[PDB]
Design a protein around this ligand. Sequence first.
Ligand SMILES: [Cl-]
Ligand SMILES: [Cl-]
Ligand SMILES: [Cl-]
Ligand SMILES: [Cl-]
Ligand SMILES: [Cl-]
Ligand SMILES: [Mn+2]
Ligand SMILES: [Mn+2]
Ligand SMILES: [Mn+2]
Ligand SMILES: [Mn+2]
Lengths: 109, 105, 83, 87, 98, 99, 94, 94
Amino acid sequence: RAKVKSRSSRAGLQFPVGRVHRLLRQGNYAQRIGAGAPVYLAAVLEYLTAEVLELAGNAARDNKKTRITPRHLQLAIRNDEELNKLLGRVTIAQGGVLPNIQAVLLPKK
Amino acid sequence: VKSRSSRAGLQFPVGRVHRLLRQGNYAQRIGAGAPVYLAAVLEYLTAEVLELAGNAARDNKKTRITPRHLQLAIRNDEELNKLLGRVTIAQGGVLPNIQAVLLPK
Amino acid sequence: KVLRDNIQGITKPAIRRLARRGGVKRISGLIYEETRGVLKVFLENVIRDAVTYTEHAKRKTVTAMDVVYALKRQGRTLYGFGG
Amino acid sequence: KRHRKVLRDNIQGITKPAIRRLARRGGVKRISGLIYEETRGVLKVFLENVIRDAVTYTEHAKRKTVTAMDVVYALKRQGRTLYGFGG
Amino acid sequence: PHRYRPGTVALREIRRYQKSTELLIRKLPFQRLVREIAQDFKTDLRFQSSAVMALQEACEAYLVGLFEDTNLCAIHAKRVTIMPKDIQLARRIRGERA
Amino acid sequence: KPHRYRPGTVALREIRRYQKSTELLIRKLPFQRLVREIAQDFKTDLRFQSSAVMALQEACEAYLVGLFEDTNLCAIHAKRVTIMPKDIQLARRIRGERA
Amino acid sequence: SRKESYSIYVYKVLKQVHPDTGISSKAMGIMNSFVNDIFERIAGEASRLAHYNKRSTITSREIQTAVRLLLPGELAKHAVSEGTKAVTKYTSSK
Amino acid sequence: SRKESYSIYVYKVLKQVHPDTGISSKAMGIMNSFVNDIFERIAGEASRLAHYNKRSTITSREIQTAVRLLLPGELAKHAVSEGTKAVTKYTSSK
DNA sequence: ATCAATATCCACCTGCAGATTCTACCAAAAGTGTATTTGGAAACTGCTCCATCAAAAGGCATGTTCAGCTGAATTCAGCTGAACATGCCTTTTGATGGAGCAGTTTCCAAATACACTTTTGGTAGAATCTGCAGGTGGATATTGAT
DNA sequence: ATCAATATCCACCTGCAGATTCTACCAAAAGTGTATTTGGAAACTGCTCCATCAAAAGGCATGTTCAGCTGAATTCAGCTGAACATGCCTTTTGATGGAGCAGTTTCCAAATACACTTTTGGTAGAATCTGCAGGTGGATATTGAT
Ligand SMILES: [Cl-]
Ligand SMILES: [Cl-]
Ligand SMILES: [Cl-]
Ligand SMILES: [Cl-]
Ligand SMILES: [Cl-]
Ligand SMILES: [Mn+2]
Ligand SMILES: [Mn+2]
Ligand SMILES: [Mn+2]
Ligand SMILES: [Mn+2]
């Protein structure tokens, strides 16, 4: 008799491998879901969460505030160039724009 | 034996359209009206672009629809424009259009 | 004698304080009307798609998810409200 | 056992007269001299990005021939859906 | 009396709002506007509090973003003032109108 | 004793000539080589359906032409009549392509 | 071997609206792509509707709200028309 | 009854990459919408991959090509990596 | 660029409610175990469809000349829109009461899923037709020079 | 305004490719009968969401003054278009050897289908915290005058 190790930790992940599997079965994405697919994806989602999370927290502490607001997450994503395309046609609530004024508009001396 | 497609007074193959709903995995299950209603919408639409196109075929003094004509059709008709904005018609051309300021005068 | 559509309730200064967030040094007087026009179109067809969602679901209250599904539908995917 | 010949620098085969011809159909009366290089600039990015996806479709499918479907599947993927080749 | 010359609060104002994140249209003028646009599609509709801010959020975003994109067009024509002429070019390139 | 047309006048004359047609405008073998090159540089040792090259050339000319009018609108917007890079960059920036 | 198309149906519907007009093979091609494209968008947009509403099946109603969502204006309206009761003619026979 | 979220997993991974960093509730909100979107895109793109090649199932192999298409540049490759890296570690489930 | 002067910013400090996080239990997933079913990987192998290759030609690109007209640069009047104080009002805010609905259990009839068995519509080459692309020369129009 | 110089239009011809037709073999609807879930239809709540309600806050409209900007007008250098001569290379066509689909078959390795056993992910209260909301007071910026 051999008992429970979550498959998510068998893959060394924080993200829920099991759930992601349930979610792919119930998405109508294909007839059958291979047992590696949900781990791989969970990894990819966990990874991606990680990547914007550090870049945002950086901008979070840069803003001299302890935690992460949508503001920071925006500053994070829009200043990073590789996240800007993945999230180009996505709008971040309560985010703002990056401060940006055109050269031509500024005073002269 | 009587097919469902003529049973609904359609040219389009309701039978197939049902089957083609088998692999989008668009859902677990397909209701029996879905292929009929839809196959109808496709038949309606192919029909609608077919007239506007054939017109341009005959303005052009030709018996046969070229992709050209289909373009003249899709782009000059404005509701059909919009459904097909982000689509490119092979061998199609553009609509003849010169900007006002460019013409001599 | 203030009988005026609420589109004009979109007060003038407020219409574009935005333009500055948009990065604009100075704006024409015509711009406000033209703007109020675009504002309305934008949200008209959005609420139209949002609502058929409310309607397909046989509901009588528009929920934020209907909005979200619709924004996505329009290619204006919004994060922070359920998808 | 016959490999040749190196393909290098083929972007300049997109001749200035041809760049012109595309441009007229676009309805352009007059073109700056810089426009041609810029254009070649823009064409090659475009054609890279498409062929990158076309090919990723070809290899996932474990073929070694790019098929028009791959092209089409890729173009569509770019939101530049093309009619007249298989979808 | 003494004060600032034209254009200068504007920059002072631009940096202020780019600095902030707050909503800029007001809530009830908007809400009123929203339900009005709504009722005209289906009668007897009500709305989640959340679903209204959802819409203000989407709009203000769309609009601000509507330009940075023309301000580029106003600047493109050796100008510094946005005009209707400019917005239409923005939307026509984006594919909203021709 | 010999001349024919003023500057600008055949320009329009060809706009009307090409807008009337549907032929591809890039030459076929030059396009193909370029394609094969970009490909080969992406993964080696590939082949191509005649079909899939035209797919690409049709798609391209479509793309480029469509930008050119978007460009031309930008040139005309700035009281100019000649397209410049300054224009193409504005077109792709608004399109959102990321130049 | 076995490639299947919509081209007969287009040709059928072609003789209905322009009896003395025909269609080139490359134009017929384009018509297919038009059919197939139009098909997934509708079928797809339906698919996620069922899914947003936690129901497991696509009924004619989904195909419809789909059409309502994705077709513009009047051909959306002549579609639901020409469409909704392609379906009774089907359910009024037995 | 109550719906379910990704916030614990996000908060967990958050404490790992920045041990001294919390997360606002609506910032958690955004992060949640983000996972979801990305989830669908990949899942969709794979779904459609699987389908072009007349294969009935989605394997990790499809999810990968999915990432290849849809994730940009270098962010694509740390992704293929952390994934095949999570997947072998899983199959070594002894 | 500096001097003097309104006028706006920006760190430094700080105590509190409104949030964020932490704690303390419960169905609902997820994980197992055992049992079956199947999709698609390997292994041939038939057969297109691709890659070169060559020859000749004539379409088309390139490189050069010459000028016209476009883009850019300066100047300048006038009118538009920014800046602000001013004064009245719409919007905010804070609960609040109650009907209105979405959210769900529970429970069957209707609708759809399987698994075969005829039966027929669609497809793939071969059999006929026959639009129209391309080559004309004759006209009309447009263009540009006197 | 006339007159020369092309270019565009446009009707007729005609053999060929590409369309249309016609026949014959097989995958795919359709037809039956039995096998399983669902999406309501009735019955019921919790929770948001509407309608008021009423004090004050700043926000908005309004009107005034001036600046600077936008639009116009002229001038000019030089760039880009039109024309030609020259000649390369693409285009055509036709052949041919072979790599590589794709079409079939065969057999595991892998996924699904149920049945229970654990475990976790999430709530609603209970226990901690930090931007804020706001009061300064010190600098940076901006402006008009020397
Ligand atoms: Cl409950
Ligand atoms: Cl038959
Ligand atoms: Cl002859
Ligand atoms: Cl033949
Ligand atoms: Cl503060
Ligand atoms: Mn797998
Ligand atoms: Mn019978
Ligand atoms: Mn190379
Ligand atoms: Mn200080």
